[PDB]
Design a protein around this ligand. Sequence first.
Ligand SMILES: O=c1c2c3c(sc2ncn1Cc1nnn[nH]1)CCCC3
Length: 262
Amino acid sequence: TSAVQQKLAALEKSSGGRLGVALIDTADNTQVLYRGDERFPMCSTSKVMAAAAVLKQSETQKQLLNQPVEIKPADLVNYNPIAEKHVNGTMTLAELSAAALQYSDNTAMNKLIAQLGGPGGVTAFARAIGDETFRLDRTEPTLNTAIPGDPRDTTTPRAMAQTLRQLTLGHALGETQRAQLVTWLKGNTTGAASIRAGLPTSWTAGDKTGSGDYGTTNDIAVIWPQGRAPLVLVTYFTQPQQNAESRRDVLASAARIIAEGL
Ligand SMILES: O=c1c2c3c(sc2ncn1Cc1nnn[nH]1)CCCC3
């Protein structure tokens, strides 16, 4: 147990919930883990895997991101800030990827999942890039039920950090696709209260948040600190009761602990 792990344990204790953290510092490839091998519901952080899987498909279909997808009234689910504007029209796979990643549009996610054949197509991509932990089992919105002990739609902090590293900094995607993924993450609109709230303001980052039942509050980030090699940081948090409140502040606190531990 490290000093950082003890600080994270103290944060967790005061939070009422269960906290999972994985850091990869690409300066030396060292890691900080807290419940790094425990499963957590991914909620919308799973949109990164789906968008990346479609990016992978686009490596062999140069026009794929321009492919139109019909958006019908019946397609709308519980959070559709972009898709609702396009009902009875179409969105391209690029537009759907951007909407999913940058606005957490759940209808957009469902279209990405459908493009991959269903939830298992997202899991298959995870396996293809060496992630043996990630599983997507359901579509939006039921993938957010976040029931304690339920393995559906879960991963571990360790696995997600490794995957995010490979996708954004490594060779899991072609260079153009990696750059597009990073551009999308860096343009996220939903992240200022989560990991990034705990980081020095001079640092830059891209991230994808998640939220669900059981007050599940998540964020996964790639971070460029001032004067340091990039970091990959995953912070997952979930609570014992179904109607628990969101706790983005806990993720900010975890990130601050990590940052001050560098
Ligand atoms: O914010 C929510 C929420 C919230 C919920 S459910 C939900 N679903 C999507 N979204 C959009 C989202 N942004 N990043 N990941 N998902 C309960 C209260 C707290 C906010």
